[PDB]
Swiss-Prot record:
Fe cation binds at residues 182, 184, 270. It is found in: Nucleus. This is Lysine-specific demethylase 4D. The chain holds residues 11 to 340 of 523 of the full protein. It catalyses: N(6),N(6),N(6)-trimethyl-L-lysyl(9)-[histone H3] + 2 2-oxoglutarate + 2 O2 = N(6)-methyl-L-lysyl(9)-[histone H3] + 2 formaldehyde + 2 succinate + 2 CO2. Keywords: ADP-ribosylation, Chromatin regulator, Dioxygenase, Iron, Metal-binding, Nucleus, Oxidoreductase, Transcription, Transcription regulation, Ubl conjugation, Zinc. It comes from Homo sapiens. Residues 8-50 form the JmjN domain.
Amino acid sequence: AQNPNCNIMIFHPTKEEFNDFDKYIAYMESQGAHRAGLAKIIPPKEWKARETYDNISEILIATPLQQVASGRAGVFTQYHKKKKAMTVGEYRHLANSKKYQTPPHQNFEDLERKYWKNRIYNSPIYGADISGSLFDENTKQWNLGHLGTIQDLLEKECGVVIEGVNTPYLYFGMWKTTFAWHTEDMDLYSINYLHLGEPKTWYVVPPEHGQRLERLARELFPGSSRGCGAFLRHKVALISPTVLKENGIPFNRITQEAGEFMVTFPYGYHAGFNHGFNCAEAINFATPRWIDYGKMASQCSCGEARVTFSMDAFVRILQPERYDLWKRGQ
Ligand SMILES: O=c1[nH]c(Oc2cn[nH]c2)nc2cnccc12
Ligand SMILES: [Co+2]
Ligand SMILES: [Zn+2]
């Protein structure tokens, strides 16, 4: 078995190897990358997503989200308070203001310490989940807007044609903006490219140990757990590395910098935070190996979790037994 300790692996494809996306994902998994739940891919030195990021200030963040925390420093939930629309230019200026700017710090490790000590006492604003792409249409390799769709993958593997499309999303971040512990919808893969700005720190639990995290979450968020059997789908719960370590939960951490890809693998729980103003792009994707994860993925039926148009068909085909009750919630 490759990568038995489930370490986060870092890959350095040549431009040649970077020319077939599906093939390279398969290669990474042949080396055991998926066992970590997360991998980093550093693109070839001659590759670029686009020429410059000089013309992005007019992108609109229609619904910026203020992330308000409740709980203890190492164990908290966050809710999203909707704010008035602003452009990326306006958002960037806000992120860089005295109220929201990254504080002085010695290194990544010091900043991480400051995050977990101080996160709950501030409410940063996140420009998350914006439909769109910053890849140049002429960028041919690893263009997140030109990937094969999950619908076409499902059709290729299971012989069923389904409705739906899947497109990329943009994430404009600032210091302390946070993504809560979760797996992807239907336990899909995700691929995330950090286009510009300050880093993004990730935490991840190996897929083979996901149920250990769930068990701890039920204990740490007893109210949320009773309300919904798959409450992490709400994407609201944070647990610090210190608390994970205290409770024996296997996990790993890594910091993503501008110009780098991160891939999350099926049923790899992850969470993290942004160091300062940045912009990332992400999309879900599937491979043949995902299919069996899709069939087993837990669903929120309490109504809280966000439901996309495309999800209907994946539940309908892969989880016909769940389909009725899942549809009632949504
Ligand atoms: O970088 C990420 N940002 C992000 O934004 C959020 C949307 N809702 N709450 C946070 N979500 C992510 C989810 N999985 C991986 C990376 C991210
Ligand atoms: Co994710
Ligand atoms: Zn729920």
